[PDB]
Amino acid sequence: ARLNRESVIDAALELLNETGIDGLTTRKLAQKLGIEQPTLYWHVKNKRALLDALAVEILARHHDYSLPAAGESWQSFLRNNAMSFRRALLRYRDGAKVHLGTRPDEKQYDTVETQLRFMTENGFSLRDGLYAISAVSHFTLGAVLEQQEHTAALNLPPLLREALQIMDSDDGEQAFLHGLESLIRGFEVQLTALLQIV
Amino acid sequence: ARLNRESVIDAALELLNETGIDGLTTRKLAQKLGIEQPTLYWHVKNKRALLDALAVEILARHHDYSLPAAGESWQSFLRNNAMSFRRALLRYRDGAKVHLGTRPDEKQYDTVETQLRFMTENGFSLRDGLYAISAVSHFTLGAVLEQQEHTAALNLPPLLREALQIMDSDDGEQAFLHGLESLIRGFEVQLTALLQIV
Ligand SMILES: CN(C)[C@@H]1C(O)=C(C(N)=O)C(=O)[C@@]2(O)C(O)=C3C(=O)c4c(O)ccc(Cl)c4[C@@](C)(O)[C@H]3C[C@@H]12
Ligand SMILES: CN(C)[C@@H]1C(O)=C(C(N)=O)C(=O)[C@@]2(O)C(O)=C3C(=O)c4c(O)ccc(Cl)c4[C@@](C)(O)[C@H]3C[C@@H]12
Ligand SMILES: [Mg+2]
Ligand SMILES: [Mg+2]
| Stretch 88-107 of chain B: residues touching chain A, C-beta under 8 Å | 100-101, 103-104, 106
Please tell me the distance from the alpha carbon of residue A54 to that of residue B108, in angstroms, as a whole number: 37
Q: Mark whether B55 and B89 lie in a shared domain.
A: no
Q: Mark whether B34 and B54 lie in a shared domain.
A: yes
Q: Which residue of B has its CA nearest to A187?
A: B182
Asked if B15 and B24 count as a contact pair (C-beta separation under 8 A), the reply is yes
Q: Mark whether B142 and B165 lie in a shared domain.
A: yes
CB contact under 8 A, B178 and A112: no
Domain that includes residue B2, residue range: 1-65
CB contact under 8 A, A143 and B138: yes
Q: Mark whether B180 and B113 lie in a shared domain.
A: yes
What spacing in Å lies between the alpha carbon of A87 and ligand 1's midpoint? 15
Asked if B60 and B52 count as a contact pair (C-beta separation under 8 A), the reply is no
Q: Mark whether B60 and B70 lie in a shared domain.
A: no
Q: Which residues of B touch A135 (CB under 8 A)?
A: 139, 143, 175, 178-179, 182-183
Q: Mark whether A87 and A158 lie in a shared domain.
A: yes
CB contact under 8 A, B103 and A175: no
Asked if B106 and A157 count as a contact pair (C-beta separation under 8 A), the reply is no
Q: Which residue of B has its CA nearest to A138?
A: B142
Domain boundary among A49, A65, A81: A65
Q: Mark whether A83 and A31 lie in a shared domain.
A: no
Which ligand ends up closest to the CA of A88?
Answer: 1
- Ligand 1 in contact with A59 (CB < 6 A)? yes
Q: Is B4 annotated as a binding residue?
A: no
What type of residue sits at position A64?
D
Domain boundary among B65, B87, B115: B65
Please tell me the distance from the alpha carbon of residue A92 to that of residue A19, in angstroms, as a whole number: 11
Q: Mark whether B22 and B50 lie in a shared domain.
A: yes
Q: How many CA atoms lie within 13 A of B34 on its CB side?
A: 3
Quoted resolution (Å): 2.1
- The residues near B189 (Cβ < 8 Å, ≥ 6 apart) are A182, A185, A186, A189, B198
Q: Mark whether A84 and A61 lie in a shared domain.
A: no
- Ligand 1 in contact with A114 (CB < 6 A)? no
Domain boundary among B21, B48, B65: B65
**Which residue's CA is minimally distant from atom 8 of ligand 2?**
B66
Q: Mark whether A29 and A107 lie in a shared domain.
A: no
Give the 3-state DSSP-derived string for A131-172, with helices as H, strands as E and coil as C: HHHHHHHHHHHHHHHHHHHHHHCCCCCHHHHHHHHHHCCCCC
For the stretch B65-104, what's the b/e string if a residue is b when 16 or more beta carbons lie within 10 angstroms of its beta carbon?
Answer: bbebeeeeebeebbbbbbbbbbebbbebbbbbbbbbbbeb
Residue A126 maps to which CATH number? 1.10.357.10
Q: Mark whether B40 and B95 lie in a shared domain.
A: no
Q: Mark whether A55 and A85 lie in a shared domain.
A: no
Cα distances from A171 to residues A126, A166, A175, B141, in angstroms, run 34, 11, 9, 18
Asked if B184 and A137 count as a contact pair (C-beta separation under 8 A), the reply is no
Q: Obtained via which technique?
A: X-ray
> How many folded domains does chain B comprise?
2
Residue B7 maps to which CATH number? 1.10.10.60
